[PDB]
Design a protein around this ligand. Structure first.
Ligand code: 5HM
Length: 159
């Protein structure tokens, strides 16, 4: 049973400038993923919700520090690299892969992602899960987390 996950993904690009928040459709997937885990006993660290989906904006420095602490604390790292790419999320993949964290990465099926993203499959303790909608993710996530979590500590290139 999984104590803690860090859930990451695009943020800045999903904020509506007119409202200063993400739309319910974009919050959709995050909230769905949060519930799923929380209902099962698993603490979810997630910046989108912590920062009221754009309304309670941090300083770059605060935001940077919290994210790195939460990543380091969570048992498993789960994130959406984003199409187009989420700059802050890619920084976080660097952090997590650099700590040898169990990671699950959520990739839109039939979309292109970076070499240094896809190249972590095998190279680190990572599992890629391609998806055409949120329910697919919700169905497959627990298995993906258990498999990566069942390899924690184990040496890897990069780990
Ligand atoms: N205010 C923010 N707080 C944050 O914690 N972040 C972190 O950086 C990621 C989003 O990066 P972008 O905002 O660059 O897409 C999120 O997963 C979040 O963990 C990003 C922003 C906006 O750059």
């Amino acid at each position: 049973a999984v104590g803690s996950v860090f859930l990451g993904g695009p943020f800045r690009q999903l904020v509506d400038p007119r409202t200063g928040v993400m739309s319910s459709g974009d919050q959709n997937v995050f909230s769905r993923l949060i519930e799923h885990f929380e209902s099962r006993g698993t603490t979810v660290y997630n910046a989108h919700r912590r920062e009221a989906w754009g309304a309670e904006f941090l300083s770059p420095a605060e935001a940077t520090r919290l994210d790195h602490d939460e990543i380091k604390a969570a048992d498993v790292f789960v994130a959406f690299p984003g199409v187009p790419a989420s700059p802050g999320t890619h920084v976080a993949i660097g952090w997590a892969s650099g700590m040898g964290k169990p990671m699950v990465l959520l990739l839109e099926r039939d979309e292109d992602y970076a070499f240094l993203v896809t190249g972590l499959e095998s190279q680190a303790n990572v599992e890629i899960l391609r998806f055409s909608g949120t329910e697919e993710i919700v169905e497959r996530l627990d298995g993906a987390v258990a498999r990566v979590l069942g390899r924690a500590g184990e040496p890897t290139v990069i780990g």
